[PDB]
Design an enzyme around this catalytic site. Sequence first.
Site, PDB file in Angstrom:
ATOM      1  N   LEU A 157       0.836  -1.182   0.000  1.00 22.77           N
ATOM      2  CA  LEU A 157       0.000   0.000   0.000  1.00 22.77           C
ATOM      3  C   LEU A 157       0.877   1.241   0.000  1.00 22.77           C
ATOM      4  O   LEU A 157       1.819   1.344   0.789  1.00 22.77           O
ATOM      5  CB  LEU A 157      -0.947   0.000   1.188  1.00 22.77           C
ATOM      6  CG  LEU A 157      -1.959  -1.142   1.203  1.00 22.77           C
ATOM      7  CD1 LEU A 157      -2.660  -1.202   2.541  1.00 22.77           C
ATOM      8  CD2 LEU A 157      -2.980  -0.999   0.074  1.00 22.77           C
ATOM      9  N   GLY A 217       3.897   0.352   5.128  1.00 17.29           N
ATOM     10  CA  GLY A 217       5.237   0.816   5.486  1.00 17.29           C
ATOM     11  C   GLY A 217       5.204   1.290   6.922  1.00 17.29           C
ATOM     12  O   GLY A 217       4.447   2.202   7.262  1.00 17.29           O
ATOM     13  N   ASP A 276       7.056   9.590   8.942  1.00 17.10           N
ATOM     14  CA  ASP A 276       7.942  10.550   8.289  1.00 17.10           C
ATOM     15  C   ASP A 276       7.223  11.850   7.921  1.00 17.10           C
ATOM     16  O   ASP A 276       7.816  12.739   7.312  1.00 17.10           O
ATOM     17  CB  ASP A 276       8.560   9.926   7.036  1.00 17.10           C
ATOM     18  CG  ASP A 276       7.549   9.731   5.914  1.00 17.10           C
ATOM     19  OD1 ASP A 276       6.341   9.579   6.198  1.00 17.10           O
ATOM     20  OD2 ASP A 276       7.968   9.721   4.740  1.00 17.10           O
ATOM     21  N   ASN A 330       5.324  12.123   5.647  1.00 19.87           N
ATOM     22  CA  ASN A 330       5.500  12.084   4.182  1.00 19.87           C
ATOM     23  C   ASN A 330       6.714  12.873   3.643  1.00 19.87           C
ATOM     24  O   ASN A 330       6.788  13.205   2.457  1.00 19.87           O
ATOM     25  CB  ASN A 330       4.199  12.450   3.449  1.00 19.87           C
ATOM     26  CG  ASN A 330       4.167  11.932   2.027  1.00 19.87           C
ATOM     27  OD1 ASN A 330       4.527  10.782   1.761  1.00 19.87           O
ATOM     28  ND2 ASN A 330       3.746  12.783   1.100  1.00 19.87           N
ATOM     29  N   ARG A 331       7.676  13.134   4.526  1.00 25.58           N
ATOM     30  CA  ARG A 331       8.941  13.753   4.145  1.00 25.58           C
ATOM     31  C   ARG A 331       9.689  12.948   3.072  1.00 25.58           C
ATOM     32  O   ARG A 331      10.278  13.540   2.159  1.00 25.58           O
ATOM     33  CB  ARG A 331       9.785  14.028   5.398  1.00 25.58           C
ATOM     34  CG  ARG A 331      11.302  13.845   5.298  1.00 25.58           C
ATOM     35  CD  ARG A 331      12.008  14.488   6.502  1.00 25.58           C
ATOM     36  NE  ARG A 331      11.180  14.472   7.718  1.00 25.58           N
ATOM     37  CZ  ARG A 331      11.302  13.598   8.722  1.00 25.58           C
ATOM     38  NH1 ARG A 331      12.228  12.643   8.694  1.00 25.58           N
ATOM     39  NH2 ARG A 331      10.489  13.682   9.765  1.00 25.58           N
ATOM     40  N   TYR A 332       9.637  11.613   3.164  1.00 27.11           N
ATOM     41  CA  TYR A 332      10.237  10.746   2.140  1.00 27.11           C
ATOM     42  C   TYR A 332       9.153  10.264   1.172  1.00 27.11           C
ATOM     43  O   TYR A 332       8.705   9.106   1.233  1.00 27.11           O
ATOM     44  CB  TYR A 332      10.970   9.555   2.764  1.00 27.11           C
ATOM     45  CG  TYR A 332      11.840   9.879   3.958  1.00 27.11           C
ATOM     46  CD1 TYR A 332      12.974  10.694   3.840  1.00 27.11           C
ATOM     47  CD2 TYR A 332      11.542   9.341   5.207  1.00 27.11           C
ATOM     48  CE1 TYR A 332      13.784  10.969   4.961  1.00 27.11           C
ATOM     49  CE2 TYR A 332      12.329   9.602   6.312  1.00 27.11           C
ATOM     50  CZ  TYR A 332      13.444  10.410   6.194  1.00 27.11           C
ATOM     51  OH  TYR A 332      14.201  10.641   7.322  1.00 27.11           O
ATOM     52  N   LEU A 339      -5.107   3.898  -1.306  1.00 27.64           N
ATOM     53  CA  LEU A 339      -6.468   3.808  -0.793  1.00 27.64           C
ATOM     54  C   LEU A 339      -7.427   4.666  -1.624  1.00 27.64           C
ATOM     55  O   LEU A 339      -7.062   5.759  -2.068  1.00 27.64           O
ATOM     56  CB  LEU A 339      -6.520   4.222   0.679  1.00 27.64           C
ATOM     57  CG  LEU A 339      -5.927   3.302   1.751  1.00 27.64           C
ATOM     58  CD1 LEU A 339      -6.037   3.979   3.111  1.00 27.64           C
ATOM     59  CD2 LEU A 339      -6.614   1.943   1.774  1.00 27.64           C
ATOM     60  N   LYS A 364      -3.793  13.295   1.929  1.00 23.63           N
ATOM     61  CA  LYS A 364      -4.271  11.950   1.625  1.00 23.63           C
ATOM     62  C   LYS A 364      -3.335  10.852   2.167  1.00 23.63           C
ATOM     63  O   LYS A 364      -3.557   9.664   1.924  1.00 23.63           O
ATOM     64  CB  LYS A 364      -4.443  11.801   0.110  1.00 23.63           C
ATOM     65  N   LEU A 377      -2.076   8.878   5.259  1.00 22.03           N
ATOM     66  CA  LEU A 377      -2.514   8.507   6.599  1.00 22.03           C
ATOM     67  C   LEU A 377      -1.399   7.870   7.439  1.00 22.03           C
ATOM     68  O   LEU A 377      -0.361   7.477   6.907  1.00 22.03           O
ATOM     69  CB  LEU A 377      -3.711   7.569   6.479  1.00 22.03           C
ATOM     70  CG  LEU A 377      -4.791   8.049   5.497  1.00 22.03           C
ATOM     71  CD1 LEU A 377      -5.832   6.985   5.287  1.00 22.03           C
ATOM     72  CD2 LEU A 377      -5.447   9.353   5.950  1.00 22.03           C
TER      73      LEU A 377
HETATM   74  N1  LIG Z   1      -3.462   7.103   0.919  1.00 19.17           N
HETATM   75  C1  LIG Z   1      -2.780   5.957   1.154  1.00 19.17           C
HETATM   76  N2  LIG Z   1      -2.948   4.871   0.365  1.00 19.17           N
HETATM   77  C2  LIG Z   1      -2.279   3.717   0.575  1.00 19.17           C
HETATM   78  N3  LIG Z   1      -1.398   3.563   1.585  1.00 19.17           N
HETATM   79  C3  LIG Z   1      -1.135   4.581   2.457  1.00 19.17           C
HETATM   80  C4  LIG Z   1      -1.826   5.868   2.284  1.00 19.17           C
HETATM   81  N4  LIG Z   1      -1.397   6.689   3.266  1.00 19.17           N
HETATM   82  C5  LIG Z   1      -0.499   5.977   4.005  1.00 19.17           C
HETATM   83  N5  LIG Z   1      -0.343   4.725   3.520  1.00 19.17           N
HETATM   84  C6  LIG Z   1       0.522   3.657   4.082  1.00 19.17           C
HETATM   85  O1  LIG Z   1       0.919   3.993   5.417  1.00 19.17           O
HETATM   86  C7  LIG Z   1       2.344   4.081   5.510  1.00 19.17           C
HETATM   87  C8  LIG Z   1       2.782   5.215   6.459  1.00 19.17           C
HETATM   88  S1  LIG Z   1       2.751   6.857   5.801  1.00 19.17           S
HETATM   89  C9  LIG Z   1       4.442   7.004   5.289  1.00 19.17           C
HETATM   90  C10 LIG Z   1       4.573   7.607   3.897  1.00 19.17           C
HETATM   91  C11 LIG Z   1       5.953   7.323   3.294  1.00 19.17           C
HETATM   92  N6  LIG Z   1       6.591   8.607   2.868  1.00 19.17           N
HETATM   93  C12 LIG Z   1       5.858   6.418   2.094  1.00 19.17           C
HETATM   94  O2  LIG Z   1       6.610   6.558   1.129  1.00 19.17           O
HETATM   95  O3  LIG Z   1       5.030   5.508   2.020  1.00 19.17           O
HETATM   96  C13 LIG Z   1       2.854   4.139   4.076  1.00 19.17           C
HETATM   97  O4  LIG Z   1       4.066   3.414   3.918  1.00 19.17           O
HETATM   98  C14 LIG Z   1       1.765   3.489   3.254  1.00 19.17           C
HETATM   99  O5  LIG Z   1       1.962   2.079   3.159  1.00 19.17           O
END
Ligand SMILES: Nc1ncnc2c1ncn2[C@@H]1O[C@H](CSCC[C@H](N)C(=O)O)[C@@H](O)[C@H]1O
Length: 187
Positions: free
Chosen positions: A100, A120, A124, A126-128, A146, A158, A160
């Site tokens: 995901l 994952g 972070d 979403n920094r990475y 999602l 978007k 989470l």
């Molecule tokens: N909108 C979304 N759709 C699908 N998976 C999501 C999502 N938001 C968060 N996630 C899941 O939740 C985890 C934590 S958020 C971490 C974001 C990270 N920068 C990345 O590259 O993935 C992510 O690894 C992802 O698997």
Amino acid sequence: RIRLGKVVPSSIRIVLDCAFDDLMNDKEINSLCQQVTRCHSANRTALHPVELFATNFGGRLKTRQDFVLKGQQNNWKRYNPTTKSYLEEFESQKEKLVYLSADSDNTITELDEDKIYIIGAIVDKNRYKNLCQNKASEQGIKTAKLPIDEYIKITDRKILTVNQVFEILSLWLEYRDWEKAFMEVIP
Ligand SMILES: Nc1ncnc2c1ncn2[C@@H]1O[C@H](CSCC[C@H](N)C(=O)O)[C@@H](O)[C@H]1O
């Protein structure tokens, strides 16, 4: 919340990929550790509990977990922490992996009982960007986001937390309805 009807376990495996320990500061580890605990809580009272995995589990996250829970994690059911990567752990079932990611071109519409969904394990903010999309692509496994953004609009909020995505997947097994699931986890 009241849950309706008898508990019927699901065959879905859900993996928390814990390979990003080195990318977090201590506050992010502690935040993530608590998010791991919420996933289990959400699983424990689910109508359709999944088999929950934690892969590449170790390092500071592991230490933090033991310090906060003082051994309690051993008594958790449908919980499988392992030092192995999800690739090693599911070598035979590689075509069943779905990572995901909010950065995926694909959108997840339905969860299949035969599939293995990966979240994952990282805080972070979403920094990475593309971290997880990139890892999965390079390994040759499918990704999917999602089907929110019929639900959340402005703009790239978007993305989470780990437990939110898990809570949403779990409720989808319960309600088989995406918007409802979103409504209870993200009000
Ligand atoms: N909108 C979304 N759709 C699908 N998976 C999501 C999502 N938001 C968060 N996630 C899941 O939740 C985890 C934590 S958020 C971490 C974001 C990270 N920068 C990345 O590259 O993935 C992510 O690894 C992802 O698997």
